[PDB]
Design a protein around this ligand. Structure first.
Ligand SMILES: Clc1cc(-c2c[nH]c3ncccc23)cc(NC2CCCCC2)n1
Length: 324
């Protein structure tokens, strides 16, 4: 039974006495440890990300977390010190685990879940990007989901950085399979369109039932890309610095259409997260009768803020269906 005095994530600096029990480890990455705990009062489950802290500089992930507030991004409930502790919402499953179950069971995830999960990912991207913040590590392991509610929540802002024009950033960010070609070609002038490529990679993976561009070397990855995308033009190569034959037979044309538009050589040619949310493939979530397979209601999909829509406000005509 641990009792800390922590600062709430969002809101005014008014510290609270937070008490928790049943502290078990749940993850152990390079970044540090992730624990699961039960808050004594609420009885609610939480995840605590324990990272080492430099007096040298103030934690960037903490700085990024504190400003963020979206239905499709984990909540930083509290944060304290020891070294830096992130008391975040507990979310049971991950797109990684879900996709794996399905591939291990030789079937694919029902298209309703693909549309639901992808849209929510694109929304969190539309939001984060409308602050010049790039996630830099979109992978199914970082896409948390509650299976009953069907809500997806982006997590791991450990490598997220606010991208400023003219400022160069490391090309070694991003995990194998989801790396945008600019990154494979070691570009330092990359934009938030890198997250869109990674998002597109997740879409295709849920559709194919396995990674679209695998390989342990950049070379191997680039080959699997050229196999589907074709050979990049000298201009396409410069911008950096099949399709219907790719997917199984009854794959929605709209899903394949959405892929081609996200998985573009030219970082400029790729859809913006908002543009993707407004794609024909998501038209079913816009249906007033749309319900989850378990009979439950779909999560909030249209509560678009001025902030979220800032990217290009006219899209709200498509984004918010008349029934709202
Ligand atoms: Cl910041 C951040 C937060 C969380 C997180 C928030 N709620 C959760 N509920 C259940 C499991 C993890 C979480 C996870 C990660 N990813 C790690 C999970 C453990 C294995 C390595 C990756 N990062």
């Amino acid at each position: 039974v641990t009792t800390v005095v922590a600062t709430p994530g969002q809101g005014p600096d008014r510290p609270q006495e937070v008490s928790y029990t049943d502290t078990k480890v749940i993850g152990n990455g390079s970044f540090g440890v992730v624990y699961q705990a039960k808050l004594c009062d609420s009885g609610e489950l939480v995840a605590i990300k324990k990272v080492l802290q430099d007096k040298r500089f103030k934690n960037r992930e903490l700085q990024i977390m504190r400003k963020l507030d979206h239905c499709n991004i984990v909540r930083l409930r509290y944060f304290f010190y020891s070294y830096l502790n992130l008391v975040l919402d507990y979310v049971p499953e991950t797109v990684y685990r879900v996709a794996r179950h399905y591939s291990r069971a030789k079937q694919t995830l029902p298209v309703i879940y693909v549309k639901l999960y992808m849209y929510q990912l694109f929304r969190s991207l539309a939001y984060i990007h409308s602050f010049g913040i790039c996630h830099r590590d979109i992978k199914p392991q970082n896409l948390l989901l509650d299976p009953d509610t069907a809500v997806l929540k982006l997590c791991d802002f450990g490598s997220a950085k606010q991208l400023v024009r003219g400022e160069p950033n490391v090309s070694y960010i991003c995990s194998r399979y989801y790396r945008a070609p600019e990154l494979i070609f070691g570009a330092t002038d990359y934009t938030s369109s890198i997250d869109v490529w990674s998002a597109g990679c997740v879409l295709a993976e849920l559709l194919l039932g396995q990674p679209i561009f695998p390989g342990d070397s950049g070379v191997d990855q680039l080959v699997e890309i050229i196999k589907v995308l074709g050979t990049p033009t000298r201009e396409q190569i410069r911008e950096m610095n099949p399709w219907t034959k790719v997917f199984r037979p009854r794959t929605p044309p709209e899903a394949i259409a959405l892929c081609s538009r996200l998985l573009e050589y030219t970082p400029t040619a790729r859809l913006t997260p908002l543009e993707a949310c407004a794609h024909s493939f998501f038209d079913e979530l816009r249906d007033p009768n749309v319900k989850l397979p378990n009979g439950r209601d779909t999560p909030a999909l249209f509560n678009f803020t001025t902030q979220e829509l800032s990217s290009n406000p006219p899209l709200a005509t498509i984004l918010i269906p008349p029934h709202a």
